[PDB]
DNA sequence: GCATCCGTGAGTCGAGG
DNA sequence: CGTGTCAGTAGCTGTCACGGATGC
RNA sequence: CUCGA
């Protein structure tokens, strides 16, 4: 399953969020399977069938109201008959008030159970009417209804593969000139946010490299000598953390291949793809998003990017400073020595 | 119908919303690694989907069957593969870094062998450099140089002693 | 339109564990 | 291999200045 | 971990 490079999603500012004009939190919900995103919608087919789908939705709302009012009448008449029966029995009027308040409580529940169904059908129709690409649907049941009803009209997806489709269905030159039009004449409050967006978009336009590289289909493995596994004088073994990170990526990617082959429920496959995303995110930059993958002893494992960061990184520790033919000892004053 | 296949997917998503988060906590205590607990949850619920007998009776607690499957998965992880390796991390302190000796002794021998080699005939030098430097067989050198089998054996037999003469004359230790 | 919050940085060398 | 009554982290905040993207 | 300038 495709996966995103954590350097361009979680790294500030979010390079993907600047390219697709998507908020960082909305992008977090998409990649990690918390919200679907609309990739395409057949807007002309929707227009040529809007009148028919509107009448069917109106008929469905009418049948929901007719069922509510019928159920409420049967309950209200049963209440009035029970009170009249407990009055013929001669029970105290305070006991009738208990049966009265219970009936009013039951009718309130019936009316509310119907109103919730009416409000869902209002959101289902509202969402399908104003459906455009790059829209997010955080409610999973709502998206399930949209596919069950108007699935012929739109195409949505989750996870990283969806963003891979949004980058594919993305006009680099048009979005570049659209930002330029805002930049030429605009308000500095809303123009500065468009300037920095052009900084990311214009880079993909001129250079000739596709933004598709921010989503990975294959991850490279660093040669073994750079992540060596050494034997210990106690007979046991000590290995580099990178081997654990690669191992967890391999374990979860092979499990995903099993679920795809077995046709397991989409809830297991999606919740597995999310874990594969977090594993590759830890391999490249563990700890960047959320809590870091701890090893034995609550110790955060080092990632590939940790080999280059800070004073202990490759640059400062092994490139800016490194030597043979050298020594050191204590210094003592020598008055007789000459200055040279 | 197609709704019957979708009812099975809405059934798995149901037991996810009632048991996954509690099963993750249980595996989290037995392993201590959150990334490992997620792997145990996915594998436990995968076996629940493969066993309709556990998903059949709702009047029977399926939670208890999950804790037992996860427990057995965790103890199996705790065997041989973890036994040897899990101990040390090179990134972690307290582990000695690997080192490789210097090539001084090898470079000095190579310099003395290169001097003794120069004092050899072009025939002997071109035979020891094809047997020890190229590692060919006796018949392979005989095929290349267009000479007899015993000719390569004899040239090698002398050239080795010729080199021993030059080295012992320069004081090379036996 | 602005308060919030995230991520960045924080001496060099040496000894023994 | 099969698995089926409660069955649910450790650890921890005793850093801070500073800037700018992120967010109600 | 602890120490030296």
From Swiss-Prot, chain A:
User: Where do the TM regions start and end?
Assistant: none
Q: What drives induction of this protein's expression?
A: 6-fold repressed by starvation.
Q: Quaternary structure? A: The RNAP catalytic core consists of 2 alpha, 1 beta, 1 beta' and 1 omega subunit. When a sigma factor is associated with the core the holoenzyme is formed, which can initiate transcription.
| The protein's role, per its UniProt record | DNA-dependent RNA polymerase catalyzes the transcription of DNA into RNA using the four ribonucleoside triphosphates as substrates.
Q: Which family does it belong to?
A: Belongs to the RNA polymerase beta' chain family.
Its name, as the record gives it, is DNA-directed RNA polymerase subunit beta'
Origin species: Mycobacterium tuberculosis (strain ATCC 25618 / H37Rv)
Q: Which residues of the full protein are shown?
A: 99 to 439 of 1316
UniProtKB/Swiss-Prot annotation, chain B:
User: Which Pfam families does the protein's record reference?
Assistant: Sigma70_r2 (PF04542), Sigma70_r4 (PF04545)
What are the recorded Gene Ontology BP terms?
DNA-templated transcription initiation; regulation of DNA-templated transcription
Induction remarks: Expressed during growth in culture; expression increases from lag to exponential phase. Has a weak SigL-independent promoter, is also weakly autoregulated, no other sigma factor allows its transcription. Forms an operon with rslA.
Q: What UniProt keywords are attached to this protein's entry? A: DNA-binding, Sigma factor, Transcription, Transcription regulation, Virulence
Tell me the function of this protein. Answer: Sigma factors are initiation factors that promote the attachment of RNA polymerase to specific initiation sites and are then released. Extracytoplasmic function (ECF) sigma factors are held in an inactive form by an anti-sigma factor until released by regulated intramembrane proteolysis. Over-expression of SigL induces 19-28 genes including polyketide synthases, secreted and membrane proteins. Might play a minor role in regulating SigB.
Its assembly, as annotated, is:
Interacts transiently with the RNA polymerase catalytic core formed by RpoA, RpoB, RpoC and RpoZ (2 alpha, 1 beta, 1 beta' and 1 omega subunit) to form the RNA polymerase holoenzyme that can initiate transcription. Interacts (via sigma-70 factor domain-4) with anti-sigma-L factor RslA.
Q: What is this protein called?
A: ECF RNA polymerase sigma factor SigL
Q: What happens when the gene is disrupted?
A: In a single sigL or double sigL-rslA disruption mutant, no visible phenotype; not more susceptible than the parental strain to several oxidative and nitrosative stresses. Infected BALB/c or DBA/2 mice showed a significantly prolonged survival time relative to mice infected with wild-type bacteria, although bacteria proliferate normally.
**Disulfide feature:** none
- Record the organism: Mycobacterium tuberculosis (strain ATCC 25618 / H37Rv)
Does the record carry Transcription as a key word? yes
User: Where, by residue number, is the motif Interaction with polymerase core subunit RpoC?
Assistant: 39-42
SUPFAM superfamilies with a match to the protein in the record: Sigma2 domain of RNA polymerase sigma factors, Sigma3 and sigma4 domains of RNA polymerase sigma factors
- Please state what the annotation says regarding this protein's domains: The sigma-70 factor domain-2 mediates sequence-specific interaction with the -10 element in promoter DNA, and plays an important role in melting the double-stranded DNA and the formation of the transcription bubble. The sigma-70 factor domain-2 mediates interaction with the RNA polymerase subunits RpoB and RpoC. The sigma-70 factor domain-4 contains a helix-turn-helix (H-T-H) motif that mediates interaction with the -35 element in promoter DNA. The domain also mediates interaction with the RNA polymerase subunit RpoA. Interactions between sigma-70 factor domain-4 and anti-sigma factors prevents interaction of sigma factors with the RNA polymerase catalytic core.
Keyword Transcription regulation on this protein? Answer: yes
């Amino acid at each position: 399953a495709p996966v995103t490079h954590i350097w361009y999603f979680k790294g500030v500012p979010s390079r993907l969020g600047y390219l697709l004009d998507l908020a960082p939190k909305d992008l977090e919900k998409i990649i990690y399977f918390a919200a679907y995103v609309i990739t395409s919608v057949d807007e002309e087919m929707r227009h040529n069938e809007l009148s028919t789908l509107e009448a069917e939705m109106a008929v469905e709302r009418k049948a929901v109201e007719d069922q509510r009012d019928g159920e409420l009448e049967a309950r209200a008449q049963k209440l009035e008959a029970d009170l009249a029966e407990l009055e013929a029995e001669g029970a105290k009027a305070d006991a009738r008030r208990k049966v009265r308040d219970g009936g009013e409580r039951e009718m309130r529940q019936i009316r509310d159970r119907a109103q919730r169904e009416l409000d869902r059908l209002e959101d289902i129709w509202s969402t399908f009417t104003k459906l455009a690409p790059k829209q997010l649907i955080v409610d999973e049941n709502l998206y399930r209804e949209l596919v069950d009803r108007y699935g012929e009209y739109f195409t949505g997806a989750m996870g990283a593969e969806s963003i891979q489709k949004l980058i594919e269905n993305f006009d680099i030159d048009a979005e570049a000139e659209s930002l330029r039009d805002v930049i030429r004449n605009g308000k500095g409050q809303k123009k500065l946010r468009a300037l920095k967006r052009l900084k990311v978009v214009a880079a993909f336009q001129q250079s000739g490299n596709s933004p598709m590289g921010m989503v990975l289909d294959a991850v490279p493995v660093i040669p073994p000598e750079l992540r060596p596994m050494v034997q210990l004088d106690g007979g046991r073994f000590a290995t580099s953390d990178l081997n654990d990170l690669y191992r967890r990526v391999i374990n979860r990617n092979n499990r995903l291949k099993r679920l795809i082959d077995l046709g397991a429920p989409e809830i297991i496959v999606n919740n597995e793809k999310r874990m594969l995303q977090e594993s590759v995110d830890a391999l490249f930059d563990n700890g960047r998003r959320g809590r870091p993958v701890t090893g034995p002893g609550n110790r955060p494992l080092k990632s590939l990017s940790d080999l280059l960061k800070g004073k202990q990184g490759r640059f400062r520790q092994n490139l800016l400073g490194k030597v043979d033919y050298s020594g050191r000892s204590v210094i003592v004053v020598g008055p007789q020595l000459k200055l040279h | 119908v197609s709704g019957a296949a979708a009812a099975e997917a809405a059934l798995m998503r149901a037991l996810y919303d009632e048991h996954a988060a509690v099963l993750w906590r249980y595996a989290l205590r037995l392993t201590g690694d959150a990334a490992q607990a997620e792997d145990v949850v996915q594998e436990t619920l995968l076996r629940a989907w493969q066993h309709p007998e556990v998903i059949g009776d709702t009047a029977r607690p399926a939670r208890a069957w999950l804790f037992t499957v996860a427990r057995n998965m965790i103890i199996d992880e705790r065997r041989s593969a973890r036994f040897r390796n899990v101990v040390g991390s090179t990134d972690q302190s307290g582990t000695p870094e690997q080192s490789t000796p210097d090539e001084v002794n090898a470079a000095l021998d190579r310099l003395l062998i290169a001097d003794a080699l120069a004092q050899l005939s072009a025939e002997h030098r071109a035979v020891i450099q094809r047997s020890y430097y190229r590692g060919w067989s006796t018949a392979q050198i005989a095929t290349d140089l267009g000479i007899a089998e015993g000719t390569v054996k004899s040239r090698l037999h002398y050239a080795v002693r010729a080199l021993r003469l030059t080295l012992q004359e320069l004081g090379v230790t036996r």
